[PDB]
Amino acid sequence: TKCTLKSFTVEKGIYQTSNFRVQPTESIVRFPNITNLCPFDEVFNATRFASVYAWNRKRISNCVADYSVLYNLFKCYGVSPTKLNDLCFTNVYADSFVIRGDEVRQIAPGQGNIADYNYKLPDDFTGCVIAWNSNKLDSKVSGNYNYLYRLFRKSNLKPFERDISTEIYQAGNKPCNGVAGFNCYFPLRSYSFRPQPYRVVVLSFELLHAPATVCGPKKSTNLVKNKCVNFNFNGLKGTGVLTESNKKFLPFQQFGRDIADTTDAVRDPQTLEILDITPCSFGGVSVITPGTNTSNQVAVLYQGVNCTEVPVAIHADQLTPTWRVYSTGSNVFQTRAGCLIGAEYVNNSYECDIPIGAGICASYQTQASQS
Amino acid sequence: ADSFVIRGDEVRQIAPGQTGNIADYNYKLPDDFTGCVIAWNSNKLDSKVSGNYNYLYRLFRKSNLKPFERDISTEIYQAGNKPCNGVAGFNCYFPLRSY
Amino acid sequence: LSSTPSALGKLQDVVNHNAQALNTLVKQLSSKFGAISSVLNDIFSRLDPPEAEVQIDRLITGRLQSLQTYVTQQLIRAAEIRASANLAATKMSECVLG
Amino acid sequence: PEAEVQIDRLITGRLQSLQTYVTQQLIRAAEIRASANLAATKMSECVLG
Amino acid sequence: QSALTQPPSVSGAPGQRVAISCTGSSANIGTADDVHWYQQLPRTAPKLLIYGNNNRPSGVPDRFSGSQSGTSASLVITGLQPEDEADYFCQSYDSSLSGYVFGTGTKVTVL
Amino acid sequence: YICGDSTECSNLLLQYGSFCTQLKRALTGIAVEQDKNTQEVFAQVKQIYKTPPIKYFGGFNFSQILPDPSKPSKRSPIEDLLFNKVTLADAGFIKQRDLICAQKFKGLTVLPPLLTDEMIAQYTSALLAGTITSGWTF
Amino acid sequence: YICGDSTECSNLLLQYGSFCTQLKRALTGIAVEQDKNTQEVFAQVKQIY
Amino acid sequence: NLTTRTQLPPAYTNSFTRGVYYPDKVFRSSVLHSTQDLFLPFFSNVTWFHDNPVLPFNDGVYFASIEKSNIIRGWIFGTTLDSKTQSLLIVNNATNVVIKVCEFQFCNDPFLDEFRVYSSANNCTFEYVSQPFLMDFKNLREFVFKNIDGYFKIYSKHTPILVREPEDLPQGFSALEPLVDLPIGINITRFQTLLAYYVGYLQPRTFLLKYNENGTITDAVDCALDPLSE
Amino acid sequence: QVQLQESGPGLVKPSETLSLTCTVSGGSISSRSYYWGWIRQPPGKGLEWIGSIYYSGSTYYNPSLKSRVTISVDTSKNQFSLKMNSMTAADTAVYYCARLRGDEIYYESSGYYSYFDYWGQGTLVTVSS
Fold first, then answer.
1. Do I46 and E104 touch (CB under 8 A)?
2. Could you tell me which chain D residue has the CA closest to the CA of C61?
């Protein structure tokens, strides 16, 4: 109260000083009980690859990825590479290919090669890529007879749209069918390197999910109910109590949403029940004092909470179950304004001295000592 | 004016929140950094086909770096879940690398 | 009073304005203000702090503007209710006490 | 990625201009409400009696 | 979730019509979708006997079918055979739990 | 309301600093002003007056405005009718599928008034007993 | 006022939420309030004398 | 096999309050949800046929069939219907459904008697044989075919009706529950059916949906439809 | 010619380790790309479902078997394994391997129904002893 009012003397009255909040006690995480590991040897190391204009998908699905082994062979999009290791999803889409040194930045969510004309990487890309430079190992002139580059067509394609037709296309003033002319060209030419193919490994991560099959290397813990806990359900972090919902979820539904843009309920990844996301109890703190000219004894009102959701046992609150750094008080009384700690309730009615709420007022009277 | 010799592939990796050969294994820049990082080509002083074995870096770490922290070790890093048992094998590496 | 449900409209408008201001403040929380997501946890779980910082600064300035707007309307309505209550106390003293 | 960065700026400024206008109209409407209540009271107590 | 009410037994006099039924809730059978009846001879695997509320698989004869309509599903068996003395089960797909609920069974006895 | 309360988002509201305290001061002033409004309207007397037990006032029947002792609310039939015609949406209580008052989980709480409905009804009863038994003299 | 005559701003103003709904309900309340003010001041007779 | 048939002029009918499906997988209950999605416009002109004409697929098609028994046994989707691009085929063959994405090569008038739908099925890339989509002129079947980038969403409903046989697509409301979510990466611009018949086209509109205590839609209002609805 | 072979021991004490393997006899039908399940039937009782697996993942479990024990499919060896670790006293029963329905090619679909068509012979396990 003194630091809020910026004074060493406090007048008589009730003062709103801080907010009562409850710490999470257990820090729990819930992942599906999987014991598999990702075979990254097939991911990083291979000898034959598909083309720059028609690449394929070696999808590593249902395999628990670890990203500390990334540098055994970078650019990263969507999620920064320090925290791909805690995300959870269902499938990993592999989108690997080969490139040229003048094409190292043209297959991207942003920046301009044959991939924009025959098979394209999306701009809304939520995966992380690996930039491997393989001239110093695979030393040769021609990469492959199936690796070819071109300059333009008459129209661009969508991401993952495949059209590898070998025909002259027209951006000029006349149609051409095997005819050279103004913007009638067939620029599809094969690679010829000088001192050597280069290779990129892409792992696209999906959205709009089923219940998740793949997680990070974090070890899941036990489920704690009816207490304020710090939870993590398949990447969904938060703090609150986990009670049973009694909600009619369909089996393909994994999350329930309230009025606001947040999650109200979540399906447990292991035991498949439905748990409410209810944040643990809080309220304003009101400090009732008769004035530092009169006394230093104060009473504390925790607004809008029960007397069971508040620190009552002041001798065991050095273990910090609450965001309140201290805990004082002797007498505990329940008021519709909140749980009042520090004032002894009497059955005698007096004129209102310090208002609290719902017909209850506080005063500093003689009972014989002052309290 | 802290000074050291890196490879050319990671000039721009002296920055907070970066992963790379020198970013997450040997040297880290703080998030509240005020100043400048200066890099230049040393082919007039250190143009060698073979490696300069007085200027090395580690490719692996066991614990994450602190800003302005030195970390000198000759230990052998274990990459896989299988124990290395002294002699380096599959997914067990001596972390120190050179140009 | 029983036959006309709109007889008590002056009090029901006060209740509806308070509940409607709070519900507007709740639906206003489900807005992006030009950011990529209205969820703070998503921006912290997908973006690095030099970009997550400006995204959440956009969201936090949205919530600052929303709260300042709500308190400005509450002060204006509190002035109106204070004028109505002063009129009610004047009518109590001059109609009931005399 | 630079366009809507500037458009967000200019929309925010114009939206704040509208919020300032609506707030001052509410304050002036309260003032005119008090003046009209006084005028109705004066009509009832000066004209009707 | 299940609410599957099924009679325990019914008279199985040969050459005579036998109608059996199971009734659940309005979430699995009342959606008019995915209710199966299974035939189980004793010490024999309970093969799929009829599906799709009336749809007959390969090998299952005629005059012996299903008449589901709404919450109640029912089989008609006109002309009971001596090889049809078995136990008949239901199975329905619910949307709230998908617990794949089964019936208690109607053990037909011939006389 | 601003931050999700499971996060370090609250470490950037210190960059603005004195703004949330200004709202908490302003809303506290509004709340104290509303309690002052109720106190100025209804606490016009310093004594709680009662009607005599024989409710005969020369043929004037006040039973629809005097409080009914047979009901636990201790209100008149008109007052019992008035509280039933207002669909009240306050949440000034400790008691915790979801209704509109699930907005409490976003940090929006409702404080209960200083005078309850029973105390306002007793002030009204005292005013009625005074103006029936004593005229304007009280 | 914010975007204009035919500037596509449905991807722009919808990102800020129901804010102009608050302006529209506020200005509508102000307009109804002045009509109520004129009604209370001048319409105090049950008959046109 | 190609077989000759008789061409007829089309008819038109009213849509009433019919053609509303579940837009998302999130289970909302006891609310009023405002959504901006593909829907059939209310009180629109639904094209009514009695033949099997080749019709366009203008970004989502509402389909309806009123019949006594199993007559219309499936659908055909694609851009071109020769052996040049891939296409989708859905056949409700008596006791099963067969769903194929292949290259295909159809005849001019595909129909079911025997099977004369196509001639070749080279390079089959998706196949799905399962419980037939068709269920129970008393029978009414509703489907919504929505081709989003990556997915082909089929929504279905089955209803026993007793109305007048011509011009009487019945009024009332029935939400269309999701039936199947095909993961097919093909372009679809045109569709055909296999042999009443109703085809309406979806448009991006704004709807208000009423979610009850059981999560089932029981009322839908279109603001665009009328000022009162707005 | 669709047959399902089943294997697994039949007598354990409570808190013991056991596993049931289900193999395909060699028919291409009910071999690789099908939905699968296990059915438990107590002696003297009716059928009741316990286990089901849909494509690679998407496992649905009985409320009795929700977190009780897991299930696995080795697709290449046509092996359908249901682990049986530390069973409670009510699991003395006959177990059946069963294919649902539905061939599917190359993708991961989304169907809202279920089946059981072909059934194994059934293996008896005893745990109350």
1. yes
2. D12
Q: Is I52 on the interface with E (CB under 8 A)?
A: yes
Q: Are A150 and A167 in contact (CB under 8 A)?
A: no
I36 has which bridge partners?
I53, I99
Is-contact A342 A298, C-beta < 8 A?
Answer: yes
Which residues in A lie closer than 8 A to residue B17 (C-beta atoms)? 80, 82
Query: Following DSSP, what letter does each residue of A121-181 receive, concatenated?
Result: --SS--SEEEEE--TTTS--S---TT-EE----SS---BT------S-EE-SSS--SS--B
The experimental method is: cryo-EM
The experimental resolution of this structure, in angstroms, equals 2.8
- Residues 85-144 of chain H with CB under 8 A from chain E are 95, 131-132, 135-136
Helix (H, G, I), strand (E, B) or coil at I106: coil
F→C interface, C-beta within 8 Å: 1-4, 6-7, 9, 12-13, 16, 19, 23, 26-27, 30, 33-34, 37-38, 40-42, 44, 78, 81-82, 85-89, 100, 103, 106, 108, 127, 131, 136, 138
Q: Which residues of C touch B17 (CB under 8 A)?
A: 48-50
Instruction: Indicate yes or no: CB of D36 within 8 angstroms of CB of G44.
Output: no
Distance CA A170, CA F84 (A): 78
**Residue C31 contacts residue C38 (beta carbons within 8 Å):** yes
Interchain touch I–H (≥3 Cβ pairs closer than 8 Å): yes
Taking contacts as CB-CB distances below 8 angstroms, the residues of chain F near C69 are none
Nearest CA in chain A to F91: A304
Classify residue H39 by burial, with Cβ atoms within 10 Å: 0-12, 13-18, 19+: buried
Residue A5, SS3?
helix
H132 contacts chain I (CB < 8 A) = no
Q: In whole angstroms, what is the distance from residue A211 CA to residue A255 CA?
A: 10
Nearest Cβ partner for C69 among D19, D33, D37: D19
Query: 3-state SS string over chain H?
Result: CCCCCCCCCCEEEECCCCCCECCCCCCCCCEEEEEEEEECCCCCEEEEECCCCCEECCCCEEEEEEECCCCCCEEEEECCCCCCCCEEEEEEECCEEEEEEECCEECCCCCECCECCEEECCCCCEEEEECCCCCCCCEEEEEEEEEECCEEEEEEEEEECCCCCCCCCCCCCCCEEEEEEECCCCCCCEEEEECCEEEEECEEEEEEEEECCCCCEEEEEECCCCCCCC
Question: Which chains are adjacent to chain F, needing at least 3 Cβ pairs under 8 Å?
Answer: A, C
- CB atoms < 10 A from the CB of D18, how many? 15
Residues of chain E contacting residue A250, judged by C-beta atoms under 8 Å apart: 95-96
**Distance (Å, whole) CA A327 – CA C26:** 33
SS (H, E, C) chain E: CCCCECCCEEECCCCCCEEEEEECCCCCCCCCCCEEEEEECCCCCCEEEEECCCECCCCCCCCEEECCECCEEEEEECCCCHHHCCEEEEEECCCCCCCCEECCCEEEECC
Closest CA to A238 of A213, A266, A214, A219: A266
Question: Considering only CB atoms, which chain B residues are within 8 Å of C48?
Answer: 17
User: Could you tell me the CA-to-CA distances from E66 to B9, D45, E62, E76 in Å, in that order?
Assistant: 73, 87, 11, 6
Question: Within a 10 A sphere around the Cβ of A162, how many other Cβ atoms?
Answer: 13
The DSSP 8-state label assigned to residue I11 in this structure reads B
Nearest C-alpha in D relative to G4: D11
Alpha-carbon distances of H105 from A339, F129, H57, H192, H195, rounded to whole Å: 78, 96, 19, 14, 18
H150 φ/ψ sector (left φ>0, alpha ψ -120 to 50, else beta): left
Helix (H) or strand (E) holding C50: helix C49-91
